[model samples]
Target: SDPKKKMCKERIPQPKNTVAMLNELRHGLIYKLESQTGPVHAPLFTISVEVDGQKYLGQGRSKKVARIEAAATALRSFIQFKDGAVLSPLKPA
Candidate 1:
């Protein structure tokens, strides 16, 4: 039997908002606007967040979307997911 599968018997609910989730997972979460480009009518915003000394970035049409993307990106670095649900944090070997 797979341990991962057995662990999934009890699901852990996660926040729908990635930004809020990231904040809950890590302390002192900070998001920065790395860059903004494209035309005035259609702009691409790049947002960045650092987690565990590694930087992750995301780009979107608006700052809110970009920030959410950035948080999700950072979360991916340490968070584990099973069947689209958050399982646990990955520990260093």
Candidate 2:
């Protein structure tokens, strides 16, 4: 009798949170407001983050989004990963 096809046992890995990634790297993350444009009601925020002695900038409607973007950019700068892919686990220093 032919053997039944084996079922693949694989699960999707959880993607790393940008801020958490930075924490794992032990880098002192400080998000600073670079600039704010447009009217007070609807302002665009430009935030910057320094990682590994380098600065990454991001712009968004809110500070939270800006911070996330900044962290994402910084993360990509050091490590390479596909879109929606989990980041490489960092080794303790």
Best by lDDT: 1
lDDT of 2: 0.64
Candidate that scores best on TM-score? 1
Give the lDDT of residue 6 in candidate 2: 36
TM-score of each: 0.65, 0.61
**Model 2 over residues 16-87: C-alpha lDDT tens digits?**
657667677646788887765645555566778887688877665556566666777787777776776554
Question: Pairs clashing in candidate 1?
Answer: none
| Per-prediction CA RMSD (Å) | 15.8, 18.2
* Candidate 2 clashes between residue pairs 3 or more apart in a chain or in different chains: none
